[PDB]
Design an enzyme around this catalytic site. Structure first.
Site, PDB file in Angstrom:
ATOM      1  N   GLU A  74      -4.499  42.303  37.106  1.00  0.00           N
ATOM      2  CA  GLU A  74      -4.806  41.383  36.038  1.00  0.00           C
ATOM      3  C   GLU A  74      -3.562  40.573  35.703  1.00  0.00           C
ATOM      4  OE1 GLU A  74      -7.502  40.315  34.443  1.00  0.00           O
ATOM      5  OE2 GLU A  74      -6.403  39.159  33.083  1.00  0.00           O
ATOM      6  N   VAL A  79     -10.196  40.258  32.903  1.00  0.00           N
ATOM      7  CA  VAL A  79     -10.428  40.945  31.628  1.00  0.00           C
ATOM      8  C   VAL A  79      -9.473  40.472  30.525  1.00  0.00           C
ATOM      9  CG1 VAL A  79     -11.361  42.906  32.864  1.00  0.00           C
ATOM     10  CG2 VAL A  79      -8.937  42.922  32.184  1.00  0.00           C
ATOM     11  N   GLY A  80      -8.466  39.698  30.914  1.00  0.00           N
ATOM     12  CA  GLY A  80      -7.479  39.166  29.984  1.00  0.00           C
ATOM     13  C   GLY A  80      -6.299  40.110  29.870  1.00  0.00           C
ATOM     14  N   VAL A  81      -5.119  39.533  29.751  1.00  0.00           N
ATOM     15  CA  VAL A  81      -3.891  40.295  29.598  1.00  0.00           C
ATOM     16  C   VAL A  81      -3.870  41.127  28.300  1.00  0.00           C
ATOM     17  CG1 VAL A  81      -2.581  38.498  28.396  1.00  0.00           C
ATOM     18  CG2 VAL A  81      -1.395  40.152  29.850  1.00  0.00           C
ATOM     19  N   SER A  82      -4.662  40.744  27.299  1.00  0.00           N
ATOM     20  CA  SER A  82      -4.755  41.537  26.068  1.00  0.00           C
ATOM     21  C   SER A  82      -5.249  42.973  26.318  1.00  0.00           C
ATOM     22  CB  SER A  82      -5.597  40.807  25.023  1.00  0.00           C
ATOM     23  OG  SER A  82      -6.949  40.739  25.428  1.00  0.00           O
TER      24      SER A  82
HETATM   25  C1  LIG Z   1      -1.525  34.407  30.124  1.00  0.00           C
HETATM   26  O1  LIG Z   1      -0.280  34.659  30.856  1.00  0.00           O
HETATM   27  C2  LIG Z   1      -0.019  35.933  31.186  1.00  0.00           C
HETATM   28  O2  LIG Z   1      -0.615  36.884  30.733  1.00  0.00           O
HETATM   29  C3  LIG Z   1       1.060  36.012  32.207  1.00  0.00           C
HETATM   30  C4  LIG Z   1       1.632  34.855  32.724  1.00  0.00           C
HETATM   31  C5  LIG Z   1       2.625  34.922  33.678  1.00  0.00           C
HETATM   32  C6  LIG Z   1       3.072  36.153  34.136  1.00  0.00           C
HETATM   33  O3  LIG Z   1       4.093  36.162  35.051  1.00  0.00           O
HETATM   34  C7  LIG Z   1       2.497  37.326  33.655  1.00  0.00           C
HETATM   35  C8  LIG Z   1       1.495  37.256  32.702  1.00  0.00           C
HETATM   36  O4  LIG Z   1       0.922  38.418  32.285  1.00  0.00           O
END
Ligand SMILES: COC(=O)c1ccc(O)cc1O
Ligand SMILES: COC(=O)c1ccc(O)cc1O
Ligand SMILES: Nc1nc2ccccc2[nH]1
Lengths: 188, 185
Positions: free
Chosen positions: A27, A85-88
């Protein structure tokens, strides 16, 4: 994020057999690839650290850092704390997450623990570079049984990803044994 | 509950000087007193356990256990997880919280960790009694420096409350050193 904490398996997959654990990485990598693709150089670096954490860096524009007018916190914090699923989800299921954004000549840093920001996103310095770095430590309250990242699982998938993402350089480094790889497909 | 976790000081009081820590007990007690009032025997028991946790028991009617029509989970869970600051604050800032409700002939139990239910409220047995019991272990990630409950800080406040809530019996027990008191006006 309490919906995620209450049933993590519904969001990240099996928390006991290693699949969900590795999904955490994938993700983050998906978001990093999207960042990298919006630029010319396009490089991401995926590092397995010795302390069982994984970091993903890109040289993209940097996640937006201005205060969201409605949420009242940095746009980056909104992305990390509000429900690919989103980084959250990743943040929610991480006992620690470190965020470093280089953007508009400034270094921004923030630390989360179990998805809870320890302080607001802070400008701590200057830089001539741009990009986003996320390093996370999977929560051992959530991830049981298989809790260590398998280099081969990441390498296989990062290799497959390189061929769908033209021009994007993907570096993988394992600090536990020094092993490294470089996947860079320049087709198209 | 993330708003609470993010700025615990703003909800419960100073998390470094013992203030907030003791406030956690006082919030639970307020709910307990209200429950006790609406019952017949009118007694609450506050216990400082040896493992740095505190339990508060009442002989009230038992908090409602039915599914909340709108939230879709037990009414008890709604109270424990949705934002006098509310017991949800205490739950959010506790590394563990155990809830036991005796109501309508049944014992119900639920466990939270950092405000997150481990399972839905569940019927675990039968009983002739009624009442609610909450035992919480304050999060040592939130409360620093002063992390052990001071008996005298609790005693002072429970004494004040006994005068205000006359008729309600308040027992205080410290299982660390056997100390105990009984406040009843
Ligand atoms: C929405 O951006 C992110 O979540 C994100 C962006 C760049 C990264 O190298 C790692 C990340 O987790
Ligand atoms: C919602 O009530 C509560 O939080 C509660 C907590 C403790 C108690 O002895 C009684 C209660 O009702
Ligand atoms: N250890 C631990 N686990 C947590 C889960 C949710 C919020 C904060 C937490 N701290």
């Amino acid at each position: 994020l309490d919906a995620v904490r209450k049933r993590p398996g519904m969001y990240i997959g099996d928390t006991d057999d290693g699949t969900g654990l590795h999904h955490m990485v994938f993700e983050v990598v998906d978001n990093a690839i999207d960042e990298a693709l919006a630029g010319h150089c396009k490089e991401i670096i995926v590092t397995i650290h010795a302390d069982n954490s994984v970091s993903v860096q890109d040289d993209g524009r940097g996640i937006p850092t201005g205060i969201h007018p409605e949420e009242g916190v940095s746009a980056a914090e909104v992305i990390m704390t509000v429900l690919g699923v989103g980084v959250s989800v990743v943040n929610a299921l991480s006992q620690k997450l470190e965020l470093v954004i280089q953007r508009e000549g400034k270094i921004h840093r923030q630390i989360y623990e179990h998805g809870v920001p320890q302080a607001p996103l802070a400008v701590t310095g200057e830089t001539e570079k741009t990009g986003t770095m996320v390093r996370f430590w999977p929560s051992l309250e959530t991830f049981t049984n298989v809790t260590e990242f398998e280099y081969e699982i990441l390498a296989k998938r990062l290799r497959e990803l390189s061929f769908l993402n033209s021009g994007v350089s993907i570096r993988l480094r394992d600090k536990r044994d020094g092993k490294e790889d470089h996947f860079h497909y320049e087709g198209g």
